[PDB]
DNA sequence: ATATATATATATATATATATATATATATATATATATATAT
DNA sequence: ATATATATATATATATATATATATATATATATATATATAT
């Protein structure tokens with residue numbers, strides 16, 4: 050259920066793999082990547098610029 | 099997976115539904131309901147309104163514009179006929195001429211129309227019919243938002259569907275000698291002759307009641323006399339005015 | 348005729364014969380109004396189709 | 398443009414002739430039997446668009462016998478459009494189906510019995 | 515009797531030779547003539563030690579040096595080719611143009627030809643490498659000098675009224691990524707030279 | 710599948726196309742190879758609507774167009790062949806070379822001995838009409854530039870150690886020298902009037 | 905039951921429109937020569 | 945002071961676009977013949 054919910058909101062990355070107990074590693078890799086960039090946490094300084 | 103997909107596509111009829119087997123009958127109810135009732139109803143609605151729109155659709159507008167251009171064709175002949183009864187020069191009379199406009203938009207509309215005709219006969223429950231209708235209506239919309247543009251004018255205005263010209267006629271043989279102002283020039287003061295003559299003739303015709311050989315009303319107002327013209331042009335104008343029997347002020 | 352007359356009182360512009368026809372002799376009767384409502388009803392039909 | 402009604406009426410008029418019934422039983426060479434539907438032309442198609450489409454709709458719903466179909470080009474149409482041209486009945490049973498009257502059944506059965514009875 | 519080639523085939527091949535490339539979008543009739551007898555085109559170029567390159571995804575045809583029993587050695591030494599050899603800064607600007615081309619391809623697909631960039635858009639990209647002459651007009655002259663030659667090879671259109679250029683699809687093959695790796699190696703030997 | 714064209718035929722055909730005209734005395738091997746494979750060469754060239762003209766008396770091969778017979782373009786135009794209109798000075802020098810080549814082919818044979826003339830002999834012929842340009846150095850520069858341009862046209866060779874050029878046989882292969890004859894008549898008439 | 909009157913289906917002819925080929929004008933690219941500026 | 949590079953002028957040739965004329969195909973009109981229905 051959770052993988053499908055993630056697929057619903059994805060844009061461009063989960064598009065490739067499916068959703069099964071063998072696909073899992075791709076999801077975690079994407080989460081690690083979107084944690085490295087720390088991107089979602091620039092928001093309230095950029096809304097100033 | 100299947101039910102999660104269905105709820106993802108769901109518009110909201112399955113909002114309260116969950117994700118486990120026991121909820122399955124809820125989904126099946128919607129499946130059977132949609133299949134049996136909703137789809138036939140919507141099909142009938144759409145096809146019925148399209149059939150109504152088929153008679154009331156753009157075809158009537160196109161026919162109306164064709165009728166208006168036909169009316170213009172009619173009346174121009176009557177004024178052209180009246181000019182045979184008088185002479186623009188001591189040896190000549192004058193004749194009107196017209197032609198069709200060729201701005202490409204009209205040809206595109208022609209193609210869209212001829213394609214739309216066939217699409218009604220396609221056995222698809224009105225699908226291709228609707229597609230062609232939308233495609234054609236696109237032209238009308240675009241012209242409407244740009245009515246000022248000459249292309250939209252030609253699309254919608256009967257006056258811009260055709261062009262006009264005038265021929266010099268031999269009073270003796272009735273033959274044409276020329277169809278152009280081959281003496282135009284100077285400071286542009288010569289063009290006024292033919293323009294003033296034709297305008298005067300049209301005004302003369304407009305004031306003749308049904309079958310009246312004369313106009314019933316004879317007063318005409320010309321403010322500023324001949325400010326633009328030279329000497330002899332005024333004499334020509336006044337002679338023409340006398341020929342039609344008006345009362346100048 | 349009883350408005351064309353009023354036009355005659357101010358006749359000064361004679362750029363083209365066909366222009367003179369289109370501006371003084373004929374009438375306009377352009378059908379922009381018809382097209383607007385025709386397309387707007389087509390929108391309602393499009394909603395059912397959608 | 399003949400609707401199925403006119404062709405059916407013509408077949409019934411033929412049925413009025415006892416000799417035609419007798420020959421169509423005694424001379425199976427009378428079968429198959431067919432009638433034309435109409436002659437489409439641009440003079441009709443050009444402005445009778447909806448009427449022609451509705452006539453085609455009516456003929457589309459016919460099942461008895463068979464209906465001939467093919468595409469006819471017209472000046473106002475960008476491509477050829479399917480049209481019906483013929484309606485075919487293959488056996489006396491089809492002719493009786495078209496006639497569809499109690500007296501028709503009476504005479505058909507009575508004559509098919511008389512020839513043997 | 516005589517081995518005269520069919521007139522349409524001769525027309526198409528003559529045009530292809532005259533310009534060295536042929537796009538269906540531009541000249542569909544000759545392109546389809548070529549792809550109707552592409553083996554004929556090959557067997558005619560084979561006498562000349564030349565070969566036909568085909569890329570239908572972009573609707574493109576181009577001529578390429580063939581391999582003789584000797585693979586043309588340095589193929590640019592082939593007698594027929596009228597132009598010189600390619601050389602570095604042309605390759606640099608080709609790489610930048612191909613970068614923009616692949617960006618446009620990801621944006622809207624490969625087969626189309628709408629990609630464009632202005633003279634001023636180009637100028638910083640090369641200015642990175644080539645330094646500043648001291649005046650904007652001089653660097654624009656540099657860029658236009660490059661573009662003239664590259665148009666001479668069919669890579670780009672002429673500088674338009676907006677001071678922009680249109681990428682030609684053939685760049686997909688001059689910037690052949692295999693050839694890009696070979697050129698990267700060649701650049702490494704250039705480093706060795708610098709060493 | 711289909712076999713390749715023979716290597717030497719390909720090489721010789723490409724060589725001639727590059728040079729337009731060639732001599733057995735220059736490259737006898739290619740000359741003999743082509744003359745032993747004329748059908749193959751013309752089959753190679755006919756798709757281009759091209760062909761070769763030869764002169765064994767003088768020992769020269771040269772290309773020639775082989776379009777369809779006499780189209781409306783009697784002043785022919787061919788895609789692969791861009792034509793030229795040599796200037797009145799170039800035409801004057803060509804007429805001078807034509808007249809002296811005609812004389813040589815009588816006093817020294819039709820290419821039996823390659824047609825020759827000295828720089829100091831050509832210069833007076835030009836000086837008949839153009840006069841003294843101002844100095845001997847200017848005369849030599851003028852004539853040498855024109856002769857080099859003709860050599861690029863494949864008409865003459867560079868002067869030998871004795872400042873004697875050699876005239877290629879192609880001069881005898883011009884199409885319509887009647888224009889050259891009229892031009893020379895006009896020149897001589899003008900100089901006779903202007904003197 | 906047969907005759908006749910009328911409807912319609914067909915064939916041919918001619919008119920009209922659309923497609924295509926060709927002729928001509930214009931714009932650009934080559935292209936080559938010469939004159940002038942700048943570098944060594 | 946000389947040589948080289950560049951820019952401009954002449955200028956010519958080629959390609960492209962657009963308009964008009966011609967040829968062909970399709971459609972429509974008219975006339976005739978045949979089939980069917982009605983009346984005697």
Ligand SMILES: Nc1ncnc2c1ncn2[C@@H]1O[C@H](COP(=O)(O)OP(=O)(O)O)[C@@H](O)[C@H]1O
Nearest residue numbers: 279280281282283284285286287288326327328
């Ligand atoms: N485009 C043109 N059309 C017609 N005539 C022209 C045109 N250009 C110049 N002329 C001629 O040049 C003159 C223009 O008119 P001009 O005599 O200069 O005007 P005015 O003296 O009335 O101000 C006339 O002789 C006219 O015939």
